[PDB]
Design a protein around this ligand. Structure first.
Ligand SMILES: [Mn+2]
Ligand SMILES: [Mn+2]
Ligand SMILES: [Mn+2]
Ligand SMILES: [Mn+2]
Ligand SMILES: [Mn+2]
Ligand SMILES: [Mn+2]
Ligand SMILES: [Mn+2]
Ligand SMILES: [Mn+2]
Ligand SMILES: [Mn+2]
Ligand SMILES: [Mn+2]
Ligand SMILES: [Mn+2]
Ligand SMILES: [Mn+2]
Length: 732
């Protein structure tokens, strides 16, 4: 293009070596997922690796010198390919796309050009191109112009479809006047070319060229001066037909060039997939190539059929990871964080619930049965394609894998929170005329004119009409009683927070629907996202605020500490837990010694709160819920750390791995490595207990939660990598 041109260091790799090219796109496609092409239509199997580079600028004059090189390439490609890279992709048979069923005609198509590179680092040379165009211009026939200096050189027959051949030497045994036979018939080459092609050979008296067609020499090695290793495919052709290609166009280039059409198809495929499925597949915030590979990993559940996933090419992620392997490890991780977020939020949504029922409720929301239904309402089954010769996989797994994708993508844990809040609660989860006095309240709620009793009326109504806004009948029922326990002066703020979130999520306008179902839903999402803390049973309220430690904030929903309608509640609880009169005996000392033994940098002035929780973690009947949360986080943090440390490992390995460092005996050991003052306090609280007890293990889990709650997600995850990760036992 003009200046609008982005570089990529495209590399085609065959059995015989690597070939380097500079791809130029006029479109931001981020990084392009490499792919590998199957054993070919006259070409060998190969692998194509990309990597983004400079943002190269081109003057009009230079851009047209590129255009020249292009046409040199198109000519070598032969008359079978339209002389435009766009037209090559934009006429692919549908069965060559990654999604033949969703071929969506993009408004734009990309505009690409290819240029040679001597190495993946050498700069773009424009003067070089012009020389190559000059040498091609000058390049003469074999008649004008030894059979050891021609060995391995590229030659094309421009009078006959511009086919490409590799010269093995000159066979003086025969001449265009010589004969060759096809069973029952013997003709002279000179007569053949006249009979078939309407070519009347001039220099007929010259010795034929012993060459082999590029189509035929699939991956085979070229022979020496001719000791001729594989000769049932050898061909002899008149020297006046062979146009000798310049030294730049060696065997390596010319073959790699046969794959450039696939790279054009790939970029084309990427673009289609995006503007066909980008709006129907939960948003991870990726763009271009990576968004493609995400949708591919996410919906192409099986592997290709012989030839490949998309046509003859099968895309792979970083470190040569199968798109299936990706889905496999993103499901594992996604499953692990869904557990974390659901734990942390249920913990606050039902502050009074026991660890017993929190666990029960989680499994009601994460259960296959439920996720399976959630995936149906997303309409993924319709888009997912597989050959059912792929057994143990479930619809429900798509949900987990998505959460994984969203998490590991640019949107972060914020994306996951958003995706869960859109999907676990939704008006689509109940059934439905309604009384008079109820429509009046609903109307008043929507235009902000609503107050205390209007909500009461609406709750009490839904509370008896059995309205379920969660994808669980138990959770929905339990949500309704949590609502009765919430001060009606508060409900207007929760609702606003819910509708606010619904708006930014793109699933509503600023106004609600004016139904008790929609109102019931918004109340839910508010309270899901924003409930401030949970109670530790018999002792104040522990505030959940690890979100405000996030290095990227979201004032629209959560606000800031210095103070909204939610932030204020959280802050309130925070100030009350500090002011708690510290009866600091030996526990308070253990808290302090733990406070400094974290071997990990914590945020500033966060200590006094950490001590308070570390105390709770170290008291006997109270750690229960902190343990629950710590357990949850540890799985998810460890899953992450391993996911990163082992880019090529799949479901089985990564599971067996983190399970080995998550066991109660293992965590217990780590608790004993703290100053003996800590072990002392544990044995002091629990009379006559033994080194193999469950309690050491669980207090570690409890401590991890204390760190998470008081210092935030990155401090807690640091503490995991520094202390828990080194205990993971290799599968070898
Ligand atoms: Mn079409
Ligand atoms: Mn003729
Ligand atoms: Mn990954
Ligand atoms: Mn409760
Ligand atoms: Mn599985
Ligand atoms: Mn699963
Ligand atoms: Mn009650
Ligand atoms: Mn809007
Ligand atoms: Mn555990
Ligand atoms: Mn690995
Ligand atoms: Mn005990
Ligand atoms: Mn435990």
């Amino acid at each position: 293009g003009a200046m609008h041109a982005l570089g990529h260091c495209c590399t085609v790799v065959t059995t015989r070596g690597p070939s380097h090219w500079l791809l130029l796109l006029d479109t931001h496609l981020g990084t392009l997922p490499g792919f590998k092409v199957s054993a070919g239509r006259g070409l060998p199997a190969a692998e194509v690796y990309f990597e983004a580079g400079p943002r190269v600028s081109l003057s009009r004059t230079d851009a047209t010198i590129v255009a020249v090189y292009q046409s040199i390439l198109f000519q070598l490609l032969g008359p079978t390919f339209p002389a435009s890279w766009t037209e090559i992709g934009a006429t692919m048979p549908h069965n060559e796309y990654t999604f033949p069923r969703f071929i969506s005609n993009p408004p734009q198509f990309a505009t690409l050009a290819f240029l040679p590179l001597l190495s993946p680092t050498s700069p773009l040379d424009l003067r070089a191109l012009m020389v190559t165009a000059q040498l091609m211009c000058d390049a003469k026939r074999l008649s004008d112009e030894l059979s050891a200096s021609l060995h391995g050189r590229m030659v094309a027959t421009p009078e006959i479809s511009w086919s490409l051949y590799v010269v093995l030497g000159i066979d003086s045994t025969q001449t265009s006047l010589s004969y060759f036979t096809r069973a029952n018939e013997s003709i002279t080459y000179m007569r053949y070319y006249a009979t078939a092609h309407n070519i009347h050979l001039r220099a007929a008296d010259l010795p034929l060229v012993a060459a082999v067609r590029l189509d035929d020499l699939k991956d085979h090695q070229i022979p020496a001066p001719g000791s001729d290793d594989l000769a049932p495919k050898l061909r002899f052709l008149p020297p006046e037909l062979c146009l000798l290609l310049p030294d730049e166009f060696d065997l390596i280039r010319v073959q790699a060039l046969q794959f450039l059409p696939e790279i054009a198809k790939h970029i084309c495929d990427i673009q289609n997939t995006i503007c066909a499925l980008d709006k129907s597949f939960p948003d991870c915030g990726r763009i271009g190539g990576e968004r493609y590979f995400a949708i591919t990993a996410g919906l192409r559940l099986d592997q290709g059929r012989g030839r490949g996933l998309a046509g003859w090419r099968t895309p792979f992620g970083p470190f040569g990871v199968s798109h299936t392997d990706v889905f496999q490890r993103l499901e594992l991780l996604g499953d692990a964080v869904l557990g974390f977020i659901v734990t942390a939020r249920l913990l606050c949504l039902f502050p009074d619930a026991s660890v017993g029922t929190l666990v029960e409720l989680k499994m009601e929301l994460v259960r296959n049965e439920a996720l399976n239904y959630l995936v149906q309402t997303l309409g993924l089954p319709q888009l997912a394609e597989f050959s059912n010769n792929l057994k143990s996989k479930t619809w429900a797994d798509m949900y987990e894998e998505i959460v994984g994708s969203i998490f590991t993508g640019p949107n972060g844990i914020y994306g996951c929170e958003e995706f869960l809040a859109k999907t676990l609660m939704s008006p689509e989860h109940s059934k439905t005329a309604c009384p008079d006095a109820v429509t009046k309240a609903s109307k008043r709620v929507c235009m902000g004119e609503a107050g205390a009793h209007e909500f009461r009326s609406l709750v009490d109504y839904a509370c008896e009409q059995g309205i379920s806004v969660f994808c669980s009948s138990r959770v929905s029922t339990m949500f309704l009683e949590r609502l009765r326990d919430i001060p009606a002066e508060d409900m207007l703020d929760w609702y606003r927070l819910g509708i606010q979130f619904s708006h930014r999520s793109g699933l509503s306008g600023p106004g609600g629907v004016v139904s008790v179902i929609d109102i019931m839903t918004h109340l839910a999402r508010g309270l899901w996202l924003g409930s401030p803390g949970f109670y530790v049973e018999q002792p104040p309220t522990i505030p959940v605020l690890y979100i405000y430690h996030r290095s990227v904030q979201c004032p629209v929903l959560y606000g800031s500490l210095t103070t909204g309608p939610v932030a204020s509640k959280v802050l309130a609880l925070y100030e009350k837990i500090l002011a708690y009169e510290s009866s600091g005996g030996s526990k308070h000392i253990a808290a302090q010694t733990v406070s400094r033994s974290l071997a990990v940098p914590i945020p500033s002035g966060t200590i006094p709160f950490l001590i308070r929780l570390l105390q709770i973690a170290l008291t006997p009947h109270v750690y229960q819920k902190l343990e629950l949360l710590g357990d949850a986080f540890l799985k998810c943090s460890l899953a992450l750390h391993l996911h990163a440390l082992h880019p090529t490992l799949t479901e089985g390995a990564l599971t067996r791995m983190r399970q080995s460092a998550e066991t109660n005996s293992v965590l217990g050991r780590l608790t004993k490595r703290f100053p003996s003052v800590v072990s002392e306090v544990i044995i002091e609280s629990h009379p006559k207990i033994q080194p193999d007890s469950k309690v050491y293990g669980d207090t570690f889990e409890a401590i991890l939660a204390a760190i998470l709650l008081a210092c935030g997600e990155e401090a807690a995850g640091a503490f995991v990598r520094e202390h828990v990760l080194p205990q993971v036992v290799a599968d070898a």
